[PDB]
Amino acid sequence: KEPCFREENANFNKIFLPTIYSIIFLTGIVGNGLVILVMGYQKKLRSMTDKYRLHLSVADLLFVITLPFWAVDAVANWYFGNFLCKAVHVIYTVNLYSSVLILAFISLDRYLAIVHATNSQRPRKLLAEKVVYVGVWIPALLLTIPDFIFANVSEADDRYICDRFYPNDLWVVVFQFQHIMVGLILPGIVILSCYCIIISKLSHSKGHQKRKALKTTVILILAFFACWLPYYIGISIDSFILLEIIKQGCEFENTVHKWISITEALAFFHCCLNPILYAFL
Amino acid sequence: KEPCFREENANFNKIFLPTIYSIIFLTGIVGNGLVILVMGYQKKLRSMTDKYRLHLSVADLLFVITLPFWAVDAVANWYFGNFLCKAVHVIYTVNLYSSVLILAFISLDRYLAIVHATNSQRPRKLLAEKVVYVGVWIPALLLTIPDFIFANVSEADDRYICDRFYPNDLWVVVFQFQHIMVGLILPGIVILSCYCIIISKLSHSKGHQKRKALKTTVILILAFFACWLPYYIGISIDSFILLEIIKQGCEFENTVHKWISITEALAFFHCCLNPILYAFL
Amino acid sequence: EPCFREENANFNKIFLPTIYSIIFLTGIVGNGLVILVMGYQKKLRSMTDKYRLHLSVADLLFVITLPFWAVDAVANWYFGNFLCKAVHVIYTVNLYSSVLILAFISLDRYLAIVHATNSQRPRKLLAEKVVYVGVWIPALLLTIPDFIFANVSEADDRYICDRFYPNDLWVVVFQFQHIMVGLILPGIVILSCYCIIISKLSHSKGHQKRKALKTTVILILAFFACWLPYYIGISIDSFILLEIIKQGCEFENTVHKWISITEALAFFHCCLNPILYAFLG
Amino acid sequence: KEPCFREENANFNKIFLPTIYSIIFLTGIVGNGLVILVMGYQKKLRSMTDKYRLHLSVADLLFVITLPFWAVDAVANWYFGNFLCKAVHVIYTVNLYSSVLILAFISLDRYLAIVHATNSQRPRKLLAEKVVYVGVWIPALLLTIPDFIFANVSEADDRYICDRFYPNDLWVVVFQFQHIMVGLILPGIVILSCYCIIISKLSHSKGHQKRKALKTTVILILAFFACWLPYYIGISIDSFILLEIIKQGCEFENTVHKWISITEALAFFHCCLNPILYAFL
Amino acid sequence: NKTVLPIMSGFKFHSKPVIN
């Protein structure tokens, strides 16, 4: 029973990670700068969906502006220290939770606007103005406390690798399962339930035009979930080969740990697609 | 002569099968639940084709319910016992025959609707109301008694793999040929003959708009057969590997057995196909 | 360096029958429907549809014995010398006839666009009489060295059916004639004719009524984009056989794999005329 | 620090460089000859963008003319001597800088047309007639002096390859850095900045119809930079794998040296891209 | 004299012997 079987090459990952990271960084910085410059300063926005899209673009801007540190971590290793590694990880965790709770808020606003078409114009205004801050941004900052006290840089063979470090594997599986839950299970079922009531109450309409604004929102939701799903499958399988269940593969561990990196780089495209939807209709 | 040079599935198969299965299961649950909840409870169906598509969505939802068992069997090995393996296999075989028999009924309905446009109004309601159950669901239930009696789990090195086990390879060959015939040859010939007839009789119209509803049906049938075609080619080559008809090697047999699993995962898209055709027009 | 070895990949013994069966199915339905719609019920109106009927006839002739290539990709040629000669001779006559039909399509478009006033007799003359003696008769007289030289080998392995030549120079001159008949001279004719078409159409920008050029442009561009990398591969193989590219036997194996895979992918021009007929593109 | 094993190109590159080069050469010479014959001989230009697009097509045609020398260098090794190698590298550098400088001038012209829409018509004619030549071409021929004096053919062991040769790696690093700046950074910041004032001043209008004349320009600029971005990433990583900042094996820069060649082939589609944007609108 | 399959010289499966 060999414990590790650690790989050494990582050939194509170190050349495909920074290209994808630079493409996401450039398109995200351009699109989020344009979106913020148009509906944060010129006040172009009209509907309550655009306020949450502005919040989503703020979170995507924050993640994209720190993404070149991930590109340098792909090519070289971390030469910046403990504080920059902590800042990168807290910004990534804040964006990763903030996008999915903002999307849950968008789906809840769409449910309230579709089925409560008479008595819900002031709760939608309150949702867009006051309660959304403690709805998404306060839990996003609250959920990265163990990231704040747990992300250090170790002393490997002149490496200085930046990653969150844990005293044992039980904390690794516990926080991986927590990330899986808060990222896919609860807000995913909230979005799915709200869209189920939307589709159930939308069939009674006699060909109304109000479903045309639902298409952009459902494209954004489907694109976000289809981007983030292979990463969630990879870390679910990683947390399952942990606790000595799928231990029979030692090359399988390297395969999962390469799959997680590759589809994490591909799942960072969710910052790219929000202004891509704004370029089209 | 010796076939015992057995090679297990690769780790990339063990990481790509569950992602495809989970994506297909999620979109199948969402789309088939929405289709059933709209046109089986709210009475939204207007055309006679939509009853058949409701039946197809029912069969696809029934398969998609048991699909996470296939995802678990892709990740780890089967731990659920005899009864759940039997139920999963009988539901898979029922859905696999029922979808293609339902699509053959759709093509027959299209031919009998457009070619016999003056007389066939009562036969269309009769075909989609009464004899459709003994047309598709009764043969799909009758083609499952060997699936009920032949599927169990083996006694491996604490693995317990759920698969259909046979006393000899001749039964495997004749069942693969029966599945090839029932899935591609006879309903393919029926669909092809009906479609050649309605295309040959559609040129006599004076540029009518009756072929506008034909496009969704022919796109659904063409995409279904394009999904299921390379799996049928792979299992036909694997059937001809036996009976000593083609003898090329054992690494070839491993390649075909890998191709079968990958193409079966890619060909499970037929549950996703009907709600994607419903979301578009 | 003992000699030059021969080896076919195990993935190319399953993927190539899949591609051959897919192309055979879509070719048989598309060309059967095109023949039964235009050449039987007299639906064709424009002057290029006679050429598309001839192209679909040659396409049907190639598609109906594409299953022999599908069997040969995975099995050995146990059909005979007659079937090997027949498959090769109609593959050659289809591959030259389709090229000559596309050249005649470009010539008819040049005669219709540039000589818009005084060309109604020679367009009809090109449509009925001289098309046979300029497309089929050169193609039938250009495939009698395919009739003589092609044979089935009596080697103890794989029983290969191929165009068998006495020395290696005959392969070179036949591949160069293949390139100069399939790509170079008809490409020069088509390019010159379409250059004159656009040069005389830019002088007539004041009226825009006709857009029958788009269908023929899309068909010709898709045909040449399909057939280009096979011509690149056989040109590289022909220059290998001159002992110019002395870069090893592994290069001559990669080239022979590329040629086979690209020929299978370049058989996809069978679904080019009826796909463009269905799409009206 | 002496790898010296950067050869043999794995032979899939030796089959994939010439196919890509021949495809891009054929469609580039067709599209650029068509664009030149339409808009330089018959005066079909109507807008101020079309003069710079004519200059871009001239530069792309000049590169595409000697692209078959790159194809021959892909298949075989260089046989044309020293002067043809110098001319090929000189006009490759001329096109490689002139296309980006043309795109920067197009973006500056769009900024002058959109933001200064009232008092900038004679500066637009000055930017389109007189100062454009010394803007784009004079830096393009002036930046080829190291290409003129540093591109030679090595008197080698029967290969005689054509590449620019340098006495030390510091000149290689500083010229790759100069390539990075002049090809991505300074025109990139100029284009992104001017498009930022374009987007900032566009939203003040009441939904004007001047926006659809900018869609073709942003598609051209975004597709050009998306083509050239992974090559710039690869040469930046290659400039860092020279000198001594990063060092992670002898196989990493063997992967980079394949990535650079493959992506340099795939990034020559910008000559193919410009007349494709003229085929559509 | 090293040898190969003798008259296998065609469009596909073509080889070439090495002379001494």
Q: E10, E17, E5: which is closest to C3 by C-alpha? A: E17
Q: What is the resolution of this structure in A?
A: 3.6
Cα A47 to Cα A34, A56, A149, A202, C208: the distances in Å are: 18, 15, 39, 20, 43
Cβ atoms of residues D63 and D27 within 8 Å: no
Task: Round to the nearest angstrom and report the end-to-end CA distance of chain A.
Answer: 56
Check CB contact under 8 Å for A204 and B37. Answer: no
The SS3 of residue B153 is strand
Is the Cα torsion angle B246, B248, B253, B255 positive or negative in sign?
negative
Query: Two tokens at D141?
Result: 């021929």
E10/C162 CB distance under 8 A: yes
Q: A226-239: b or e for each residue (b if 16 or more CB lie within 10 Å)?
A: bbbbbbbbbbbbbb
For residue C137, CA distances in Å to C56, C89, C202 come to 17, 14, 37
Dihedral sign for Cα D206, D207, D208, D214, please: positive
Please give the full DSSP string across chain A, using - where no structure is assigned: --S-------TTHHHHHHHHHHHHHHHHHHHHHHHHHHHTSS----SHHHHHHHHHHHHHHHHHHHHHHHHHHHHS---S-HHHHHHHHHHHHHHHHHHHHHHHHHHHHHHHHHH--SS-SHHHHHIIIIIHIIIIIHHHHHTTHHHHHHEEE---SS---EEE--SSHHHHHHHHHHHHIIIIIHHHHHHHHHHHHHHHHHTTSSS-GGGHHHHHHHHHHHHHHHHHHHHHHHHHHHHHHTTTSSTT-HHHHHHHHHHHHHHHHHHTTHHHHHHHHHH--
Say whether the E–C interface has 3 or more Cβ pairs within 8 Å: yes
Name the residue of chain E whose CA is nearest to C1's CA: E18
E residues 1..20 contacting C (CB < 8 A): 2-5, 7-18
Residues 6+ apart with CB under 8 A from B37: A196, A199, A200
Residue of chain C nearest D39, judged by CA positions: C202
Question: How many alpha carbons lie under 13 Å from residue B132 in its C-beta half-sphere?
Answer: 25
Is D259 within 8 Å of A15 (Cβ atoms)?
yes
Nearest CA distance, D238 vs chain C (angstrom): 27
Cα separation, B162 vs C221, whole angstroms: 51
- The answer to whether C249 contacts chain D (CB < 8 Å) is no
d(Cα C174, Cα C177) in Å, to the nearest integer?
Answer: 5
Residue B187's Cβ-count burial label (10 Å; 0-12, 13-18, 19+) is buried
Q: Is C37 on the interface with B (CB under 8 A)?
A: yes
d(CA C71, CA C74): 6
The Cα–Cα gap between D237 and C27 comes to: 48
Minimal Cα–Cα distance from C2 to chain D, Å? Answer: 21
Could C258 and D38 be called an inter-chain contact, meaning their C-beta atoms sit closer than 8 Å? no
CB B250 within 8 A of CB B3: yes
**Chain C neighbors of E10, CB-CB under 8 A:** 162-165, 171
Q: How far is E8 from chain C (nearest CA, A)?
A: 7
Cβ pair B68, A236 in contact under 8 A: no
**A246 to B38: CB separation less than 8 angstroms, yes or no:** no
Amino acid at C49: D
B22 in contact with C, Cβ within 8 Å: no
Contact A17, A76 (CB under 8 A): no
**Chains in contact with chain D (at least 3 beta-carbon pairs closer than 8 A):** A, C
Contacts of B234 in chain C (CB under 8 A): 14, 18
**SS3 state at D280:** coil
In B72-197 the beta strands, taken as DSSP E runs, fall at: 151-153, 162-164
Does the distance separating the beta carbons of D230 and A9 come in below 8 Å?
no
Helix axes C15-34, B186-202, angle to 10 degrees: 30
Strands A162-164 and D162-164: unpaired
Instruction: Please give the C-alpha separations between residue B4 and each of B251, D15, D26, in angstroms, as whole numbers.
Output: 12, 38, 52
Type of residue found at C218 = I
CB contact under 8 A, C232 and D26: no
- Give, for E14, the enclosing helix (H) or strand (E): none
Residue B8 DSSP symbol: P
| Closest to D215 in 3D by CA, of D231, D232, D227, D198 | D198
Q: Do E13 and C162 touch (CB under 8 A)?
A: yes
Pairing of strands A151-153, A162-164: antiparallel
Task: Kindly report the backbone phi and psi dihedral angles of residue C153, in degrees, each rounded to the nearest multiple of 5, phi listed first.
Answer: -75, 155
Residue B10, beta-bridge partner list:
none
The closest of B132, B136, B151 to B90, measured between CA atoms, is B151
Q: How far apart are CA C10 and CA A69, in angstroms?
A: 43
Nearest CB to A203 within list B11, B30, B38: B38
Instruction: Sort out which chain A residues have CB atoms less than 8 A from B44's CB and list them.
Output: 203
Yes or no, beta carbons of D19 and C229 under 8 Å apart: yes
DSSP sequence for C146-194 = HHHHEEE---TTT--EEEB-SSHHHHHHHHHHHHIIIIIHHHHHHHHHH
Whether residue B241 contacts residue B233, with contact meaning beta carbons closer than 8 Å, is answered with no
Longest dimension (CA), chain C: 70
Closest chain C CA to residue B260? C14
Q: Within 10 Å of residue D48's Cβ, how many Cβ atoms?
A: 18
Chain C interface, mutation test: which of B185, B189, B252, B257, most C Cβ atoms within 10 Å? B252
d(CA B115, CA B109): 10
Identify which of D20, D1, D4, D24 has the alpha carbon closest to the alpha carbon of residue D12.
D20
Contacts of A30 in chain D (CB under 8 A): 192
For residue D276, give how far its alpha carbon lies from the nearest alpha carbon of chain A (Å): 20
D63 within 8 A of D92, measured Cβ to Cβ? yes
Rounded (10°) angle between helices D186-202 and A13-39: 30
CB within 8 Å: C25 and B229: yes
> Do A12 and D252 make contact, defined as CB atoms within 8 angstroms?
no
D76:C239 CB<8 A? yes
Cβ–Cβ below 8 Å for E5 and C164: no
What backbone phi and psi angles, to 5 degrees, belong to A54?
A: -65, -40
Residue C159: closest CA among C77, C97, C243? C77
DSSP code per residue over D121-169: SHHHHHHHHTHHHHHHHHHHHHTTHHHHHHEEE---SS---EEE--SSH
- The method recorded for this entry reads cryo-EM
